[PDB]
Paper text:
Nervous necrosis virus is a member of the family Nodaviridae that contains two genera: Alphanodavirus, which usually infects insects, and Betanodavirus, also known as piscine nodavirus. Virions of the Nodaviridae, including NNV, are non-enveloped, 25–30 nm in diameter and contain 180 copies of a single type of coat protein subunit arranged with T = 3 symmetry. The coat protein precursor self-assembles into T = 3 provirions. Provirions mature by spontaneous autocatalytic cleavage of the coat protein alpha post-assembly, producing proteins beta (38 kDa) and gamma (5 kDa) which remain part of the mature virion.
Here, we show that both transient expression of the coat protein of Atlantic cod nervous necrosis virus (ACNNV) in Nicotiana benthamiana leaves or in transgenic tobacco BY-2 cells leads to the production of VLPs. For a detailed structural analysis of the plant- produced ACNNV VLPs, cryo-EM was performed on the sample prepared from N. benthamiana leaves. Single-particle image processing was carried out in Relion, which allowed us to determine the solution structure of the VLP to a global resolution of 3.7 Å. The ACNNV VLP is an isometric particle with T = 3 symmetry, consistent with previously reported structures of the grouper nervous necrosis virus (GNNV) VLPs which share ∼85 % sequence identity. The shell domain displays the highest local resolution which allowed the building of an atomic model of the capsid shell. The viral asymmetric unit is composed of three quasi equivalent copies of the coat protein which have a characteristic jelly roll topology, with clear side-chain density. Three P-domains of the capsid protein interact and form spikes on the particle surface. The P-domains are attached to the rest of the capsid protein by a linker region and display lower local resolution, presumably as a result of flexibility. Overall, the cryo-EM analysis confirmed that the structure of the plant-produced VLPs is very similar that of material produced in other expression systems. When administered either intraperitoneally or intramuscularly to sea bass, the VLPs were shown to confer partial protection against subsequent challenge with ACNNV, indicating that plants can be used to produce effective vaccines for use in aquaculture.
Residue numbers in the entry:
A (entry chain B), C (entry chain B), E (entry chain B): 52 to 214
B (entry chain C), D (entry chain C): 34 to 214
The structure:
Amino acid sequence: NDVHLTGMSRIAQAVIPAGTGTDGYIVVDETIVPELLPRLGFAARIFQRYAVETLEFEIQPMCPANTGGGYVAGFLPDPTDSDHTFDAIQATRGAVVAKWWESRTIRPQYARALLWTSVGKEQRLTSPGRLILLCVGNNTDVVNVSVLCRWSVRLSVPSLETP
Amino acid sequence: ADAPLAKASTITGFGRGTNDVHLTGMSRIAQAVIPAGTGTDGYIVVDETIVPELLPRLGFAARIFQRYAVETLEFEIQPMCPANTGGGYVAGFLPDPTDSDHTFDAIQATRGAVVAKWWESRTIRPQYARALLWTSVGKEQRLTSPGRLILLCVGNNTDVVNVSVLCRWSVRLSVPSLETP
Amino acid sequence: NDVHLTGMSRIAQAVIPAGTGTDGYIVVDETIVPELLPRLGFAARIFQRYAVETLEFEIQPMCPANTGGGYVAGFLPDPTDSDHTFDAIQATRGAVVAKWWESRTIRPQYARALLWTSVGKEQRLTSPGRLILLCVGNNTDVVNVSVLCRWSVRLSVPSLETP
Amino acid sequence: ADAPLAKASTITGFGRGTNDVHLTGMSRIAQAVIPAGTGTDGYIVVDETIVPELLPRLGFAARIFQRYAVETLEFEIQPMCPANTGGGYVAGFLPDPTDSDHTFDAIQATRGAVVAKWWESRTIRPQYARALLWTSVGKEQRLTSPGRLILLCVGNNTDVVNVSVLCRWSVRLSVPSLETP
Amino acid sequence: NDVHLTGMSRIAQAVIPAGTGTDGYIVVDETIVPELLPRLGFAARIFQRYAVETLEFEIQPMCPANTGGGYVAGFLPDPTDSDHTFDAIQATRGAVVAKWWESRTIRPQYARALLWTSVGKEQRLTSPGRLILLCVGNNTDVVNVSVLCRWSVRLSVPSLETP
């Protein structure tokens, strides 16, 4: 009928050797589809329609304190296929920027419409935006960032997919 | 008075032992060391169930009583290395005393799980079972241990790390007996 | 649906010749399973789950007054397979000790959980403890002890076993 | 906030165990049997010191704590034979844990000593040391055991007697530790 | 007749090269006898009986901040000859644990009886416990710990020893 899930889950993880990662180097650009969240990924294989109530992100990077580069992150509510720059992430509401040893918190501005789980011909009805984390400095040592999520959603209309 | 065939036994208070105790404290669980280079993501540092044996003052006092019920139970991680390490860890608490959960996704999912770098210590406020368990061993594990602690590394540490997890327990042992371990 | 039985029934009976029965000699060690009580044995072949409300024991030994040994009894809420000594029965709540011509009353401390009737892989869910009656003296003549019970239980969830 | 060389260890409650417990109960001390004809006057039936080992639930709980202080301590004799025996006994309690008092005159002299026939049971309300002792063994005996129980026959019994002495103890173990016996 | 001394004094000092000192490695295990404290050592060669009023310890380790091991300490009021482990120090009241660059404060639970100064056949009457400081990590560089004390005592009954 109608549920209300919470959770906290890894979205993605990337590793960067030294020398790589000038300004504008995209570390991770992935849309918020149910296939990426693990516990919602098993729960959106049941239902059909969900609507996010609150949704927040944390970056949680892991490097020694002698790194001396930095990152920027944001949340773009166009799930298009072209925003690869610093200035699109500058404009948005709830963006963060810090050095590589510091964790910050993205409090985005989502859509609060009512979406679908499966794929379709239109992209705007199945994912409420994109996360983009791109390096702004030029790092010294190997970093290892591990972005988290904090999702709360209200899945309904029971079915079953065959992915 | 006069003299019968046998006077009755005057053992008055027989089998009237103590009933309710409250033991608290803090004791470690386990401790390991990892050389440099070893310890990629998913490498299990420590996985030891909370049986009353690993808490040492409780295990000498649960050999008397039969049943215990954990009132408050918290954990502290305390890694020991300078701020030039740069790997990380993830800690959790899984109330299954089963034998297959070895991934980052299972540990992050539970309630009150933490993740931090090797030069930073965190604190677990877990979701324990709050039931009333047994002390002696048996065939089924789900009645004698309120879960497992699993701690595993997530990065690739640079120097030698040295973690030492602890445990702040409080319990209310009752129903007196004495067993043989 | 839900019943409430009472009763009073023989658990076991043993006989001891002269010379036998030093201290620590087990006369009867049997768990409280429904197969031992007679009227509950016919009634727990119907239902599946029972929960004891009140349960008490009496020893009722029968010997002439020139016996001059004694016994101890108790109730151990571990239905394990190893407690054969005096000191495990010493510790428990509601133990008794008297000479062979005297009856005493065990008022135990049971579990008040909700158990099963049939057998299973785990022993703790099918029997709320053990009765142990062991001689503490070194008797003179032939005794004949006959322990009783006084059980009250609330059987439910109807089925039928095939023992 | 900013990033230092090493964050301080946040182990908050370390070494804050329980302090005061009160254990009571009843447990036997020893038990013997005497054939007919044996057991003239002065024959020692039972002579065993009250070390915490002979009380079995206390000995599994004094392996934690360091010091105990006996609050109340009483004894019950309970012989088992019919009224055709006609010998006797004498019971006492000597607060020396030494090793030479084997006569009727030493046992009758103490406070709260009893004497009766074999078909009658009595009760000892002794004069214990009421100090604050230790639990582990050492060179000196006078700091770890609050006296001895000595019971010996006084007549010449006719049939087989069978005595079974008991002990009603209550104690207040404290100052937590853990030893190795 | 009766005095009241205070003070602050070195108990012991040890040095540990790199590689040595795994978990359970005893750095210093010495009883609190008057022969170890310096100012009380000259004052307990006068009198015979003392009784500690307040007595506290500090660890004061000295190493660069890149050490990354740690220690544990405590106070065991058995002056026996066998407690060499972590778990005996875990149980006691007023134990401390920190990394090698950090000083902590032991506030023990002593005996407050009235003791002797000289040696004797029994150990329990001449020393109110033991200090045990043992490494719990596996250190990187050379540390140099220097434990202190803070003793206050009330010596009496004048005599003179010949050690």
